[PDB]
Amino acid sequence: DTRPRFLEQVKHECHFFNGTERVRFLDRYFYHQEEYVRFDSDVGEYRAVTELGRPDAEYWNSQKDLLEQKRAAVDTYCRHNYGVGESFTVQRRVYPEVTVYPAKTQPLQHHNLLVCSVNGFYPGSIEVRWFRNGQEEKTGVVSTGLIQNGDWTFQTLVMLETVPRSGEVYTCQVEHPSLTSPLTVEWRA
Amino acid sequence: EEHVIIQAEFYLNPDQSGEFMFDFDGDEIFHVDMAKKETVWRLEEFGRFASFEAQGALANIAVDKANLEIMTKRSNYTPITNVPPEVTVLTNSPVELREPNVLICFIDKFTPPVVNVTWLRNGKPVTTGVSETVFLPREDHLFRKFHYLPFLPSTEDVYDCRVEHWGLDEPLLKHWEFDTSG
């Protein structure tokens, strides 16, 4: 199917700072991936983002009733909708499951990677640190980064390149808004 | 920001496909099934605490269609350029033999919002228990999407997520098999 495609998008955005103390609303219109016109509550009128959007800017700005709907959106739409979902979005907290297992940088080598697998948490902000004998190890650390599962949970793998010796105790430490103190998981060679 | 809520919509010609959803910090709250004219909550529990009149989405999609006609002409019928997806296959939990898990196929950074996605087990299509999200908005105004396949890990089975998109010359297959202690 090589028929040409044409895409229109609209994004009505509500940006919240300090709860609902500061709120900014954007009414954004796109052709393919190009935003062509937008209303920003910081301004209170539509402004063309590209030349393509100039007619819409002028036309919509000429309608004061339309503009007043958009000007009141931070209150009637943004603050309202925030309130509606606050309990299961803003206040959603799901603690991570934390696993540590050995791995290999190259499959024919002996184990030289410690994987700290952090799974199922929400929201996304998390801090994961590796320790060897109570000292933080900041060298040889690599991660998948933060991964969205698409189902309101995240995961990340944080790996420490190291050669385990007998006696050594490795600790993966996890900090997250759902926890009241760091979560730690030990691994011994 | 502390949080961002976006009501994101699109309408695509000539497919005549439209979508309407709410996004909170990059996760989907709900979308409207256009055909059934029903609100679909991303998580079941969301629907017990809130509601949405699906009818409202229909009116918006109508305007989206009308605006598309206008912008199509205004642009001198300049069509969209295909942007093919990046595809990643991962599990949602560390894998243990014979312990139920879920394969995730993450399809990212593409447009237009149209793809054919197949799960393959040992090279054969499988559909038992699979699920998917609708098209999710990106800040760069491309799209992303997730597909899901519950499975029981074994040393026997291998899996692929096969993705077809107009921006791709050939279907893109991303492989998964049981990792052997490495």
């Binding site: 036309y59 309202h80 309130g83 509606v84 | 009501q7 919509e9 605490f49 989405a57 918006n60 605006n67």
Partner: peptide, 13 residues
Amino acid sequence: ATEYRVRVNSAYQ
């Protein structure tokens, strides 16, 4: 409040 409100789309003409 328990009902999500829709933000209407501006139409060109």
